[PDB]
Write an enzyme that holds these catalytic residues in place. Structure first.
Site, PDB file in Angstrom:
ATOM      1  N   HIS A 193     -49.370  57.356  11.184  1.00 31.51           N
ATOM      2  CA  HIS A 193     -48.412  57.951  12.116  1.00 31.51           C
ATOM      3  C   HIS A 193     -48.626  57.441  13.549  1.00 31.51           C
ATOM      4  O   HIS A 193     -47.654  57.355  14.325  1.00 31.51           O
ATOM      5  CB  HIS A 193     -48.461  59.471  12.039  1.00 31.51           C
ATOM      6  CG  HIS A 193     -47.500  60.033  11.029  1.00 31.51           C
ATOM      7  ND1 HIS A 193     -47.702  59.936   9.659  1.00 31.51           N
ATOM      8  CD2 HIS A 193     -46.274  60.600  11.186  1.00 31.51           C
ATOM      9  CE1 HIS A 193     -46.649  60.427   9.028  1.00 31.51           C
ATOM     10  NE2 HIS A 193     -45.773  60.841   9.928  1.00 31.51           N
TER      11      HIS A 193
ATOM     12  N   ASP B 273     -42.498  58.741   4.463  1.00 32.07           N
ATOM     13  CA  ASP B 273     -43.249  59.725   5.244  1.00 32.07           C
ATOM     14  C   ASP B 273     -44.336  60.335   4.323  1.00 32.07           C
ATOM     15  O   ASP B 273     -45.491  60.524   4.758  1.00 32.07           O
ATOM     16  CB  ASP B 273     -42.258  60.790   5.769  1.00 32.07           C
ATOM     17  CG  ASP B 273     -42.806  61.602   6.934  1.00 32.07           C
ATOM     18  OD1 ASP B 273     -43.733  61.148   7.633  1.00 32.07           O
ATOM     19  OD2 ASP B 273     -42.247  62.696   7.163  1.00 32.07           O
TER      20      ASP B 273
ATOM     21  N   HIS C  21     -37.543  57.600  10.414  1.00 30.34           N
ATOM     22  CA  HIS C  21     -38.966  57.923  10.561  1.00 30.34           C
ATOM     23  C   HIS C  21     -39.798  57.401   9.388  1.00 30.34           C
ATOM     24  O   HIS C  21     -40.748  56.614   9.582  1.00 30.34           O
ATOM     25  CB  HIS C  21     -39.157  59.451  10.662  1.00 30.34           C
ATOM     26  CG  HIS C  21     -40.596  59.893  10.689  1.00 30.34           C
ATOM     27  ND1 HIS C  21     -41.456  59.571  11.720  1.00 30.34           N
ATOM     28  CD2 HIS C  21     -41.304  60.661   9.832  1.00 30.34           C
ATOM     29  CE1 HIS C  21     -42.637  60.131  11.498  1.00 30.34           C
ATOM     30  NE2 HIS C  21     -42.575  60.802  10.361  1.00 30.34           N
TER      31      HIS C  21
ATOM     32  N   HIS D  17     -46.676  54.282  13.556  1.00 29.24           N
ATOM     33  CA  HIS D  17     -45.250  54.609  13.652  1.00 29.24           C
ATOM     34  C   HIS D  17     -44.925  54.890  15.110  1.00 29.24           C
ATOM     35  O   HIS D  17     -43.934  54.359  15.630  1.00 29.24           O
ATOM     36  CB  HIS D  17     -44.899  55.886  12.841  1.00 29.24           C
ATOM     37  CG  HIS D  17     -43.630  56.564  13.292  1.00 29.24           C
ATOM     38  ND1 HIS D  17     -43.579  57.400  14.389  1.00 29.24           N
ATOM     39  CD2 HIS D  17     -42.360  56.493  12.818  1.00 29.24           C
ATOM     40  CE1 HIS D  17     -42.335  57.824  14.568  1.00 29.24           C
ATOM     41  NE2 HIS D  17     -41.574  57.283  13.631  1.00 29.24           N
TER      42      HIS D  17
HETATM   43 CL   LIG Z   1     -46.802  62.467   6.077  1.00 29.46          CL
HETATM   44 ZN   LIG Z   2     -44.076  61.952   9.541  1.00 31.65          ZN
END
Ligand SMILES: [Cl-]
Ligand SMILES: [Zn+2]
Length: 364
Positions: A253, A170, A270, A256
């Site tokens: 993101h 992340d 995540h 994702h």
């Molecule tokens: Cl991030």
């Molecule tokens: Zn994130």
């Protein structure tokens, strides 16, 4: 026009054994605290009688239902006594987001205590809300960031290394996405532009991961705290939090988010899926060869996925990959913060190229 805005939690406290100064931190708000805690944490991390040692702050301890839903936020809110001075969340992402939402609803300060360093959400003025079944429902943008974020690195080191590595995934996205927003002059989560400080913290996040990530992973494999682990927990939490919220989000993101349309990816964390979004974004946005090599080498040494198979998509069809790309390119997605115009076909192609490159590096 060209005005920046950077937002911050009020106090960030971190170190081995920091849970032992939680009472001191709560006392700065008053004598009554409402605590939302993850059941596993209550029984196996803090211990069921942990709060019995408090003498200056009265605690109303409530076990979290497990889902950050409007229903659970309402249930807990109704258990808070009016004389409450501060709301506390202790546990993983859903517990923390619930605490932030309850505090917001009741106009009370909030203290956030992550027990894993797996995402950069703790310091943010955001709560992700789900249906009772765990399906995404909506984002709740909060008017204030948490008053205190307290991270006990010893608790983090005792959690599985997989969670620290996912936090690094992340965090890995932070610099690439913030740099794209900087180049585009795109707004951050506040609606204004990011500051030189926000972009510099996003870059520091990345540099810290490259330098200390493997050392921190070795430390957590032995449930041990070292200064290298402290630096990575700070990078996964404070630096990455400020960088994504005040710097901005972009391709990684959004990719994702597109990956969530394929159910085989649901068993992955995540940060593990964000790493695939980062790698695809390096091809998408024309990074130079040495940068692509640097990022893949980092993922390989810490154990982040570098191929679609590593997130449950071995042999995935073009049809399935195009669904991912279309979802990633929704008109309201963050991928449009990239300087270059992006279409679904571009993302589809980048995912396939990034996967082939990762497979060849691994002799597959
Ligand atoms: Cl991030
Ligand atoms: Zn994130």
């Amino acid at each position: 026009h060209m005005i920046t805005t950077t937002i911050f939690p009020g106090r960030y406290v971190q170190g081995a054994g920091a849970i032992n100064i939680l009472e001191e931190e709560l006392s700065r708000f008053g004598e009554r605290a409402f605590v939302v805690i993850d059941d596993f944490v209550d029984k196996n991390v803090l211990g069921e009688n942990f709060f019995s040692s408090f003498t200056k702050v009265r605690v109303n301890k409530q076990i979290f239902g497990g889902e950050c839903s409007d229903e659970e936020i309402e249930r807990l809110s109704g258990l808070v006594e009016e004389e409450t001075d501060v709301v506390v969340g202790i546990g993983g992402g859903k517990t923390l987001d619930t605490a932030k939402a309850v505090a917001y609803k009741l106009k009370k300060p909030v203290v956030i205590v992550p027990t894993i360093a797996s995402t950069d959400a703790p310091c943010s003025a955001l709560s992700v809300i789900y249906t009772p079944n765990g399906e995404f429902k909506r984002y709740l943008f909060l008017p204030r960031n948490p008053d205190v974020v307290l991270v006990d690195t010893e608790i983090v080191a005792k959690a599985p290394a997989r969670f620290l590595v996912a936090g690094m995934g992340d965090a890995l996205a932070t610099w690439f996405e913030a740099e794209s927003c900087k180049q585009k002059y795109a707004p951050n989560m506040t609606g204004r532009l990011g500051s030189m400080t926000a972009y510099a913290l996003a870059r520091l996040c990345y540099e810290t991961l490259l330098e200390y990530g493997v050392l921190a992973k070795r430390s957590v494999e032995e449930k041990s705290v070292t200064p290298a682990l402290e630096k990575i927990v700070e990078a996964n939490t404070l630096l990455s939090g400020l960088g994504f919220e005040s710097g901005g989000l972009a391709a990684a993101h959004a990719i994702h988010n597109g990956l969530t349309v394929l159910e085989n990816t649901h068993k992955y964390l995540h940060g593990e899926k964000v790493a695939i979004g980062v790698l695809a974004s390096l091809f998408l946005t024309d990074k130079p060869r040495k940068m692509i090599e640097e990022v893949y080498s980092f993922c390989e040494e810490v154990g982040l996925p570098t191929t679609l198979a590593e997130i449950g998509l071995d042999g995935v069809s073009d049809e399935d990959l195009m669904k991912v790309a279309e979802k990633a390119c929704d008109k309201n997605e963050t991928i449009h913060n990239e300087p270059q115009p992006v279409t679904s076909k571009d993302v589809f192609f980048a995912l396939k190229a990034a996967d082939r490159y990762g497979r060849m590096r691994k002799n597959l």
